């Protein structure tokens, strides 16, 4: 395909000249090799799965950790290249067929990272020496306060959950409610607070959470948004 | 080593043998102590298309890649060898294909 | 990056994945027969077929994205 590329650019007049330039390994050869590799898939074989190669520095083949002496193969015909790209990609095969079990699930460091990411607050006796938190109006204010070292990853905070649908719960009745004489009341729960009134309506939920939990939710929401950006 | 060198981070009594260490790209400490050492490290010294790959490719139904890998990447000439050796055992492995249009029994080149 | 969502869209469009991929291979080989421009550099016939088909779906993708 490098020879065919050198013919396509007319930089070699015959296949022997193309082979001679390939032997000379001049930068032109690597530019045409980058042109050839662009959009051409290859099979990797341990266990046999196909990927888009990208020309990389060094000499040892580089593989993605979740897809991880691998052998390498080029599909030669156009029908084979089509079948490879449309059937044989990891995108097409995220499920193990034996029951339909997701293969690529976060594992090793990432999972324990996510575990710590989602460990969040120290609870109760582990958090206060004796028996007896900021509010953030949106999650980017909380992340900003974390970056500015006003709060730590483990530390409890309140986020205004103005998307006041989709509140998570444990089927637990309110741990406490406060009613003001003027008919506002606050419901306090082990995980969140709701301010609502007999006149007017619910003002806001405030969820008691951590920078870690916020980041876990936000980076998935922003991954969905980043993918669906192309839907525009 | 700590008290002789006055390096109190070498033996931190709170978590002996571990120490807090810093990100060279940030200068902030990683918030949990990291185990540190000077261990002794040694530098170490330094295409078959397999049947289970055939089974996997045909499981994907990706059979044109399977055809490529088993034929023109190296009837196929190895099937010619197979038929020739059976023909040398005095067995005629005879390959026919039937015309859907004409029912003609075309003998394959074998 | 994005092109595989188009692939998935077309996989979702066609009623048989294998028949879809057969039709893509057919379209590419008839393209490379009805036109004999070399068309083999930074853009590839498979991506061209996927692009034209997603443009039939109405979506603003250029030839080979």
């Amino acid at each position: 395909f490098v020879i065919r590329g050198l013919i396509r650019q007319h930089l070699a007049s015959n296949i022997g000249v193309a082979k001679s330039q390939i032997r000379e390994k001049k930068p032109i050869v690597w530019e045409i090799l980058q042109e050839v590799m662009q959009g051409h898939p290859v099979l990797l074989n341990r266990g046999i799965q196909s990927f888009q190669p990208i020309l990389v520095e060094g000499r040892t083949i580089c593989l993605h950790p979740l897809v991880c002496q691998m052998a390498v193969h080029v599909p030669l015909s156009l029908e084979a290249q089509a079948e490879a790209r449309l059937l044989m990609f990891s995108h097409m095969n995220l499920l193990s067929p034996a029951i339909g079990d997701p293969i690529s699930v976060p594992t090793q460091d990432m999972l324990i990272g996510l575990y710590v990411l989602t460990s969040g607050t120290r609870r109760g006796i582990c958090a206060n020496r004796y028996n007896p938190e900021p509010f953030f109006c949106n999650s980017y204010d909380a992340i900003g306060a974390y970056r500015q070292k006003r709060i730590n990853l483990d530390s409890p905070l309140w986020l205004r959950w103005q998307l006041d649908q989709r509140v998570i719960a444990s089927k637990e009745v309110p741990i406490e409610v406060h009613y003001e004489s003027f008919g506002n009341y606050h419901e306090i729960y082990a995980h969140y607070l709701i301010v609502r009134s007999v006149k007017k309506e619910t003002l806001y939920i405030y969820i008691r959470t951590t920078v870690g939990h916020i980041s876990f939710y936000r980076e998935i929401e922003e991954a969905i948004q980043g993918f669906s950006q192309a839907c525009s | 080593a700590s008290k002789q060198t006055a390096n109190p981070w070498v033996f931190e009594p709170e978590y002996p043998g571990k120490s807090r260490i810093f990100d060279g790209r940030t200068g902030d400490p990683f918030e949990q102590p990291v185990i540190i050492g000077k261990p002794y490290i040694l530098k170490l010294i330094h295409q078959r298309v397999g049947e289970m790959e055939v089974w996997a490719l045909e499981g994907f139904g990706v059979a044109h890649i399977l055809q490529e890998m088993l034929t023109y990447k190296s009837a196929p000439e190895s099937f010619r060898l197979l038929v020739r050796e059976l023909r040398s055992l005095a067995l005629e492995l005879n390959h026919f294909l039937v015309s859907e249009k004409n029912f003609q029994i075309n003998r394959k080149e074998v | 990056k994005v092109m595989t969502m188009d692939i998935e869209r077309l996989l979702l469009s066609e009623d048989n994945r294998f028949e879809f991929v057969n039709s893509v291979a057919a379209e590419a080989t008839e393209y490379v027969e009805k036109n004999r421009d070399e068309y083999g550099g930074t853009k590839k016939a498979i991506f061209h077929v996927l692009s034209n088909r997603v443009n039939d779906l109405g979506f603003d993708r250029p030839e080979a994205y």
């Binding site: 079948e83 059937l87 | 139904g61 990706v62 059979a63 | 294998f18 028949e19 991929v21 057969n22 291979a25």
Partner: peptide, 5 residues
């Protein structure tokens, strides 16, 4: 697979 027919 692809070569169903």
């Amino acid at each position: 697979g692809t070569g169903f027919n």
